[PDB]
Point group: D2
Chain length 260, copies 4
């Protein structure tokens, strides 16, 4: 199986990458960073996020595996000390594929579409942020505040969590919208609560005054001008993970937030 | 079709019930509060909750309809002034069935099982509340605080919402666990965030010291003694609603929380 | 100086108490649990709370000191291993007095008044909790939910904190009101935010329907019937601590919540 | 008494300003926008904020009055229809002065100091925001998240409120620090809770990596580079309001958030 290895780029990760490549050379495994079938990310979640976006055009033909040489490393399944065992199991091909839902963001001015593994957020390009929130064509609320965050299930443990959102098991095909510092008084009103949307539900954001927004997709933050609308929906595309052992989402959550 | 009508029991609701019964008499519709196929609740959500629990043994053979003579009336689809039109449409049989997921609660000492339309909560029988939270057999956290709330999708707009939980579209077969005043310090740690569980996931609560708990299921609150565990899962059973017109969940939410 | 020592009552604490008493016997220090000038609490915050309430009638003539043989021990200034040094310093009389504000609760039916070091809360005697919140005679809100919590500054790190309240430095003579699971929809509205009141401000709770409430003052929970109103204000009374060394409130907070 | 009038600048406000000036001309009142003793702001809170900052160098010699021609208008005491009565009372000099505490922000690179009526916030100049929070020289926490907000008492109803902060009566000389989307996991830890600091307490923010920050003071947002630290304390300066009638803070809060 063709494979490639991304590295955090520090001494630890680069060296681990070289040793794994050496180990793969001992098997019938070809290194290909153009059309790999397996992508190994060595680092933290930032590194993993980069790996995903590097191959967001071949998500259907790739299974990802993360090795934790970072700090938290939520998307990682392996410790550096287990790298050799990983090489072996990957060789023998003893693994099952697991899929997590992704978030599709469409920005219309022309249209640009982005794919997110964690979340997509919107803020003002400086100045007051005000947007009408439209759900399946029904006007739901006019949001005034710092911004909004739309999260995938696996992303609910990231930015979403910090914003008071619920943690959502990845087997649920959904997206979750959370508020950033909503204004609520006699005249201005938002739902307040995070909202969880099923697949096939469309959430659209529509400018009220200012049409310039800072839009983020995972680690990438882009300024969009003359925006007509931002549209969120659960992507038809899924990220696939290669699992060689049981590591339940809730245990992953426990280890990352309660105690490791 | 056999039908029955529950009433809030005030002047307004009783009279509306009598007029509807009269209207039904003009059709080939038999009133039967033993084995009805349609249950009409006239009142608020409290009244609707009572109706559901009165027939929780025949949920598969019943479609519910709510008329709003209460204050908020979230589960209601009709205003009193539309009662006549409702009678007519019910007669002609022009309606489609819609299903919402329910929550199963099992209390083991012997075992008692309850079914919830909104939520099930647990608190201490007076004194400190401490329980181990076990998800699919994995020990997730030890919860210290006032109590916990497990909500259905349609219940997420109720108690769940007040506790900071996410609002969850009823098409998502899930349950959501929220905290009540969790203690979090150097020594005590909880996830904090609401947790959303898919169908077939089991959340079990296990006593640490005190074994006596006050357990609520919707409007019903019962004291259980010598409790060994409380087990939550998404019920295989669903409540069925009779819909004669489009009234999307998110519009229902908008009307109840943003503006009517 | 007359002194008394309260003990958690476990093996560790009782023995520590005996050794300290022995050490005090070597000085001109008389043990008196009737009219002591110094009260030493050996245990956790629960033990300290008990000590305070045991002498809430002589708060003006007493300085408290806590020794930590409990788990968290927020009000404690000493570790068991330092007991000998404490005995010595207490003997030589090398210490300065520090005062924290207290909360006065008045319950009218006849009137009963309670004094709180941490907080006073109100909940329903079973059933729905609804009260009108009146601030300095002006009707502020009608609260529907689980209950309310009124906290002292030093109490803001306790129950108050779990309810989303702000942490408040004890030098600020104030009380803070937090909500428990307030209902907020189209028809029901509360402020949501914690409220911080200065000295001489009076917050009164007035029943809307049910007149029976469960009222807590620190560790004590009492059911009151035929309640006409509950009145909160910053007490004119203060608790005095004996400080032999610098241990700033914010460091106390850091040690208890961030890292020890 | 010398006076000046700021205007929102719309048709309504400008015309109201002209009529008031005409009314003042009928008395011995001189219009002076250089060294006025009374500053009347006609508009919303944004307009009022601008008025305050226009004369932040003469806060000791000025009493402010707001007229509400805006939307919410929290700092306003008057409706446009009462302008004539205001002119009269201002003439006869029938009013009492009321003072609210202010927030001092010091930015060191050289030093710049700003004065805030509502709040001062800090965010990253793009990229991750990380700062060490130092309280009175003691290292309290390392904050990772979107940013921080330090609010005056009267400012607690603004940005502070949206961030989950407590509402604080203006008679309390304090400042309140709230978090924006703090990261909290196994490795990263913040207090979470808003913090309320008394006068003479100093809160300092110190860069960990990036030294560039976006710093806001009320409506003004400035990018600072090569920042060594940001220092917050309760200002020795106070804003003075001219009150011609009783309008308690808590009633002001009720009217702005509960019902007008
Ligand atoms: N800001 N930020 N990101 C830093 C934290 O987010 C973590 N992170 C990124 N993605 C996730 C994620 N999906 N779940 C939990 N934590 C995550 C990353 O590892 C850092 O600990
Ligand atoms: N790992 N990493 N970096 C990208 C992630 O940063 C996360 N992030 C950014 N800001 C915050 C934040 N304030 N809290 C938690 N996570 C955050 C977000 O989830 C992005 O996917
Ligand atoms: N406490 N309580 N219940 C009172 C409010 O809860 C409302 N309620 C009950 N069930 C729901 C519900 N599912 N969604 C929203 N509100 C609900 C009920 O109508 C009252 O307005
Ligand atoms: N309608 N009704 N009564 C039953 C509902 O009361 C709701 N409830 C009880 N306490 C609260 C509460 N504090 N906030 C919101 N809802 C609440 C809960 O959802 C029950 O299903
Ligand atoms: N529930 N409860 N109480 C248990 C926790 O509250 C702690 N506690 C009591 N009073 C305070 C307090 N004032 N500040 C912080 N923690 C406190 C006590 O030590 C336990 O850790
Ligand atoms: N130590 N102790 N026991 C009494 C304290 O318990 C605290 N307490 C009770 N319930 C909670 C709670 N849910 N969270 C935090 N603290 C709590 C409250 O502050 C009382 O003063
Ligand atoms: N974002 N923003 N500001 C808009 C809202 O904040 C309001 N505002 C400004 N200052 C305060 C304030 N101090 N209290 C309450 N609301 C305030 C202003 O009137 C707008 O309604
Ligand atoms: N009026 N006005 N504009 C300035 C105020 O905007 C307020 N503000 C900015 N963002 C928010 C926000 N997200 N929520 C509430 N208030 C906000 C803040 O209090 C400033 O003083």
């Amino acid at each position: 199986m063709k494979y490639m290895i991304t590295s955090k780029g520090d001494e630890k990760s680069d060296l681990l990458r070289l040793n794994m490549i050496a180990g793969f050379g001992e098997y019938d495994m070809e290194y290909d960073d153009v059309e790999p079938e397996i992508v190994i990310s060595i680092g933290g979640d930032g590194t993993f996020l980069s790996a995903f976006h590097q191959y967001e055009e071949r998500l259907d033909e790739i299974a990802f595996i993360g090795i934790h040489t970072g700090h938290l490393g939520f998307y990682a399944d392996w410790r550096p000390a287990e790298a050799d065992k990983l090489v072996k199991l990957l060789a023998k091909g003893e693994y099952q594929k697991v899929s997590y839902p992704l978030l599709k963001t469409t920005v219309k001015y022309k249209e640009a579409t982005y794919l997110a593994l964690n979340e997509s957020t919107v803020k003002s390009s400086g100045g007051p942020f005000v947007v009408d929130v439209v759900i399946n064509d029904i006007h739901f609320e006019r949001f005034r505040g710092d911004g909004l965050c739309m999260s995938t299930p696996s992303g609910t443990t990231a930015y979403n969590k910090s914003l008071g959102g619920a943690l959502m098991h990845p087997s649920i095909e959904a997206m979750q919208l959370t508020e950033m510092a909503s204004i609520n008084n006699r005249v201005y009103r938002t739902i307040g609560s995070p909202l969880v949307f099923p697949k096939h539900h469309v959430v659209s954001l529509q400018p009220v005054n200012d049409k310039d927004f800072q839009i983020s997709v995972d680690h990438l933050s882009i300024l969009h001008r003359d925006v007509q609308e931002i549209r969120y929906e659960v992507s038809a595309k899924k990220i696939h993970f290669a699992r060689f052992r049981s590591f339940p989402f809730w245990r992953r959550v426990h280890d990352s937030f309660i105690e490791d």
